[PDB]
Enzyme design. Structure first.
Site, PDB file in Angstrom:
ATOM      1  N   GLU A 103     -84.433  17.868  48.883  1.00 16.39           N
ATOM      2  CA  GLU A 103     -83.297  18.247  48.167  1.00 16.39           C
ATOM      3  C   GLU A 103     -83.221  19.297  47.132  1.00 16.39           C
ATOM      4  OE1 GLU A 103     -81.075  14.487  48.517  1.00 16.39           O
ATOM      5  OE2 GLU A 103     -80.825  13.891  50.021  1.00 16.39           O
ATOM      6  N   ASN A 159     -87.741  18.997  52.155  1.00 22.67           N
ATOM      7  CA  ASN A 159     -86.685  18.076  52.762  1.00 22.67           C
ATOM      8  C   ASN A 159     -85.387  18.580  52.280  1.00 22.67           C
ATOM      9  OD1 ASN A 159     -86.146  16.562  55.532  1.00 22.67           O
ATOM     10  ND2 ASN A 159     -85.460  15.206  53.735  1.00 22.67           N
ATOM     11  N   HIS A 162     -77.355  14.960  57.814  1.00 19.93           N
ATOM     12  CA  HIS A 162     -76.600  14.272  57.935  1.00 19.93           C
ATOM     13  C   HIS A 162     -75.215  14.764  58.033  1.00 19.93           C
ATOM     14  CE1 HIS A 162     -79.361  10.581  56.243  1.00 19.93           C
ATOM     15  NE2 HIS A 162     -79.736  11.902  55.845  1.00 19.93           N
ATOM     16  N   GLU A 222     -82.879  12.559  59.376  1.00 23.58           N
ATOM     17  CA  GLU A 222     -82.502  12.036  58.727  1.00 23.58           C
ATOM     18  C   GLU A 222     -81.518  11.908  59.839  1.00 23.58           C
ATOM     19  OE1 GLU A 222     -82.032  11.690  54.460  1.00 23.58           O
ATOM     20  OE2 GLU A 222     -84.627  12.236  54.594  1.00 23.58           O
ATOM     21  N   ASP A 236     -77.961  11.286  61.878  1.00 24.71           N
ATOM     22  CA  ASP A 236     -77.161  10.703  61.953  1.00 24.71           C
ATOM     23  C   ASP A 236     -75.886  11.523  61.836  1.00 24.71           C
ATOM     24  OD1 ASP A 236     -76.529  10.997  59.331  1.00 24.71           O
ATOM     25  OD2 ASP A 236     -77.260   8.641  58.497  1.00 24.71           O
TER      26      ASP A 236
HETATM   27  O1  LIG Z   1     -78.199   9.022  51.226  1.00 23.30           O
HETATM   28  C1  LIG Z   1     -79.084   9.396  52.288  1.00 23.30           C
HETATM   29  C2  LIG Z   1     -80.119   9.860  52.466  1.00 23.30           C
HETATM   30  C3  LIG Z   1     -80.109  11.135  52.080  1.00 23.30           C
HETATM   31  N1  LIG Z   1     -81.603  11.577  52.319  1.00 23.30           N
HETATM   32  C4  LIG Z   1     -82.239  11.248  51.638  1.00 23.30           C
HETATM   33  C5  LIG Z   1     -82.046   9.911  51.817  1.00 23.30           C
HETATM   34  O2  LIG Z   1     -83.440   9.411  50.657  1.00 23.30           O
HETATM   35  C6  LIG Z   1     -81.288   8.914  51.485  1.00 23.30           C
HETATM   36  O3  LIG Z   1     -81.705   7.809  52.350  1.00 23.30           O
HETATM   37  C7  LIG Z   1     -80.881   6.581  51.382  1.00 23.30           C
HETATM   38  O4  LIG Z   1     -81.677   6.427  49.655  1.00 23.30           O
HETATM   39  C8  LIG Z   1     -80.398   5.402  48.829  1.00 23.30           C
HETATM   40  C9  LIG Z   1     -81.346   5.644  47.895  1.00 23.30           C
HETATM   41  O5  LIG Z   1     -82.530   5.322  48.098  1.00 23.30           O
HETATM   42  C10 LIG Z   1     -80.133   4.185  49.843  1.00 23.30           C
HETATM   43  O6  LIG Z   1     -79.888   3.596  48.442  1.00 23.30           O
HETATM   44  C11 LIG Z   1     -79.807   2.317  48.633  1.00 23.30           C
HETATM   45  O7  LIG Z   1     -79.833   0.578  49.387  1.00 23.30           O
HETATM   46  C12 LIG Z   1     -78.788   0.327  49.262  1.00 23.30           C
HETATM   47  C13 LIG Z   1     -77.788   0.809  50.726  1.00 23.30           C
HETATM   48  O8  LIG Z   1     -78.209   0.859  51.811  1.00 23.30           O
HETATM   49  C14 LIG Z   1     -78.677  -0.213  48.449  1.00 23.30           C
HETATM   50  O9  LIG Z   1     -78.723  -0.951  48.092  1.00 23.30           O
HETATM   51  C15 LIG Z   1     -79.350   0.693  46.710  1.00 23.30           C
HETATM   52  O10 LIG Z   1     -79.434   0.867  45.859  1.00 23.30           O
HETATM   53  C16 LIG Z   1     -80.490   1.707  46.849  1.00 23.30           C
HETATM   54  O11 LIG Z   1     -81.969   1.361  47.028  1.00 23.30           O
HETATM   55  C17 LIG Z   1     -80.062   4.336  51.031  1.00 23.30           C
HETATM   56  O12 LIG Z   1     -80.779   3.096  51.998  1.00 23.30           O
HETATM   57  C18 LIG Z   1     -80.415   5.237  51.938  1.00 23.30           C
HETATM   58  O13 LIG Z   1     -80.496   5.397  53.785  1.00 23.30           O
END
Ligand SMILES: OC[C@H]1CNC[C@@H](O)[C@@H]1O[C@@H]1O[C@H](CO)[C@@H](O[C@@H]2O[C@H](CO)[C@@H](O)[C@H](O)[C@H]2O)[C@H](O)[C@H]1O
Length: 314
Positions: free
Chosen positions: A127, A169, A205, A233, A235
């Site tokens: 990003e 990415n 996404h 990724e 969805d």
């Molecule tokens: O935001 C969607 C994706 C965008 N591209 C990069 C990816 O790395 C990103 O993935 C998301 O990245 C977020 C930030 O790292 C993730 O949020 C996390 O996950 C949680 C809920 O899904 C929360 O508990 C929390 O504060 C946090 O740790 C989430 O799961 C995860 O799907």
């Protein structure tokens, strides 16, 4: 094929999922993980906050759990992600200049060394670009280090891991637009100067009913720069609750994306960003949106499942 893994295996392509290793203790989740995918990525376990919570102090238990899962089940392991502006620990944000550059390099080096020979590909930088073109405007890396940090990160990753495929990415780069053009320019530049870089990730996404029509053409121009490409990724989110119409359009959308990949010889495959709607990131970020994945919150297959099977060739 009767499974998505079978369809992808039969096609000679990857079909991956984003794993939360804590969910492995839920047997229905594990059953689907084991049987439906031939690749795995850590949804969160290999990010900077998850791996280096204080400076030069590493916590690899969660990422190792994902790696061990891959090895135990014979799935390709994809690494996500060494350098990303989001959720960077405060200790890192508090550094500047060469101290910050050194922390970045040490993080890349230690994490890549740790997973060496297990992780087959890395999202080295995630990003880096801005919707509308040019560099991202809320990144600690961009603000503290400027344009050169991407090249620094890729070279450090290669230094640490001589063979891993090194990817950049991004999202909103699926169509041909200012953002993917900025990304395309960097890829072409890196390849022209011999900066290590092997692959480009298209997060995908997407919103139901809105798959870019030029997705294949975009994937192809990138591949033609001499790199591999991947849908990383996937969805496809809708306004909740789902209904028959939205589910059908979503299925058609999944088919379009997988087909776009199938139609590009250097598209390694497609990774979906989770298994079940129960655990998807979407609803928390986008209120009133969701139902974006291939399994619903009760782990029932949605119409998207058949569409993915059909697209891989089954
Ligand atoms: O935001 C969607 C994706 C965008 N591209 C990069 C990816 O790395 C990103 O993935 C998301 O990245 C977020 C930030 O790292 C993730 O949020 C996390 O996950 C949680 C809920 O899904 C929360 O508990 C929390 O504060 C946090 O740790 C989430 O799961 C995860 O799907």
């Amino acid at each position: 094929a009767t499974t998505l893994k079978e369809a992808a295996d039969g096609a000679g392509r990857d079909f991956g999922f984003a794993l939360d290793p804590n969910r492995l203790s839920e047997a229905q989740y594990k059953a689907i993980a084991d049987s439906e995918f031939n690749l795995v990525v850590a949804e969160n376990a290999m990010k900077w906050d998850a791996t280096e919570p204080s400076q030069n102090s590493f916590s690899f238990g969660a990422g190792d759990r994902v790696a061990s899962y891959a090895a135990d089940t014979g799935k390709e392991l994809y690494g996500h992600t060494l350098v990303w502006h989001s959720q960077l620990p405060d200790w890192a944000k508090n550094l500047n200049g060469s101290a910050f550059e050194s922390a970045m390099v040490n993080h890349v080096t230690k994490v890549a060394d740790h997973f060496e020979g297990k992780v087959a590909s890395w999202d080295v930088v995630n990003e880096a670009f801005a919707d509308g073109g040019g560099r991202r405007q809320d990144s600690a890396f961009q603000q503290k280090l400027g344009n050169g940090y991407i090249e620094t990160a890729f070279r450090a990753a290669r230094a640490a891991d001589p063979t891993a495929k090194l990817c950049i990415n991004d999202y909103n780069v699926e169509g041909i637009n200012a953002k993917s053009n900025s990304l395309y320019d960097l890829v072409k530049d890196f390849k022209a100067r011999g900066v290590p870089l092997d692959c480009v990730g298209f997060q995908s996404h997407l919103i139901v009913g809105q798959v870019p029509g030029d997705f294949r053409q975009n994937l192809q121009r990138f591949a033609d720069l001499g790199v591999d490409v991947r849908i990383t990724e996937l969805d496809i989110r809708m306004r909740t609750p789902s209904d028959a119409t939205k589910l059908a359009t979503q299925a058609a959308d999944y088919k379009k994306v997988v087909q776009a990949c199938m139609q590009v010889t250097r598209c390694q495959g497609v990774t979906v960003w989770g298994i079940t709607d129960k655990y998807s990131w979407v609803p928390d970020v986008f209120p009133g949106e969701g139902a974006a994945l291939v399994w619903d919150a009760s782990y029932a297959k949605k119409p998207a499942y058949a569409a993915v099977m059909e697209a891989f060739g089954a």
